[PDB]
Amino acid sequence: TSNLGAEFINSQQGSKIQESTKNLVMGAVRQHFRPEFLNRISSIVIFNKLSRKAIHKIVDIRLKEIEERFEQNDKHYKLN
Amino acid sequence: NEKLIHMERDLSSEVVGQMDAIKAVSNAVRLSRSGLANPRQPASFLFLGLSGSGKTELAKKVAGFLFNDEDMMIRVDCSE
Numbered sequence: 354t355s356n357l358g359a360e361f362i363n364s365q366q367g368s369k370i371q372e373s374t375k376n377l378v379m380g381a382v383r384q385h386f387r388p389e390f391l392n393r394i395s396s397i398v399i400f401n402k403l404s405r406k407a408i409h410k411i412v413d414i415r416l417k418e419i420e421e422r423f424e425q426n427d428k429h430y431k432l433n
Numbered sequence: 434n435e436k437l438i439h440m441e442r443d444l445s446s447e448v449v450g451q452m453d454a455i456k457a458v459s460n461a462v463r464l465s466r467s468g469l470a471n472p473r474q475p476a477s478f479l480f481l482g483l484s485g486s487g488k489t490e491l492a493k494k495v496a497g498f499l500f501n502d503e504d505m506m507i508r509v510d511c512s513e
Contacts, residue, residue, distance in 0.1 A: 384513050
């Protein structure tokens with residue numbers, strides 16, 4: 354895993370990372386690791402800006418789990 | 434020379450086109466294998482063409498033949 358690509362990914366030019374930005378990331382990755390090392394990786398994957406439309410759902414997941422993991426529901430919220 | 438020549442013929446057949454390149458290399462390698470080239474000097478070549486042209490593979494095939502192993506190839510990124 355790596356935030357190496359952040360150097361270009363953090364341009365935030367759309368949540369979906371575009372070709373160009375990704376090639377700059379690729380370049381930088383090859384600068385950091387022997388390209389042959391990298392050529393044994395099945396694929397290099399570039400993650401997108403986590404979209405607000407996603408986050409708007411993620412927080413429900415998190416809030417549910419946050420509460421459920423607090424031992425027993427002797428307190429917690431109704432979580433409305 | 435004969436081990437090389439039999440392999441040069443396979444090299445010419447395996448590489449798409451680039452026969453002229455193969456022959457240039459073959460000639461120099463034979464000169465060197467014979468001991469006629471001054472032994473102090475390793476053979477060396479400048480592979481001039483298109484990126485994506487197979488120049489690397491030619492060299493790998495040369496390794497694949499002259500040293501009987503394509504994976505013995507040692508590589509240098511000169512742009513970084």
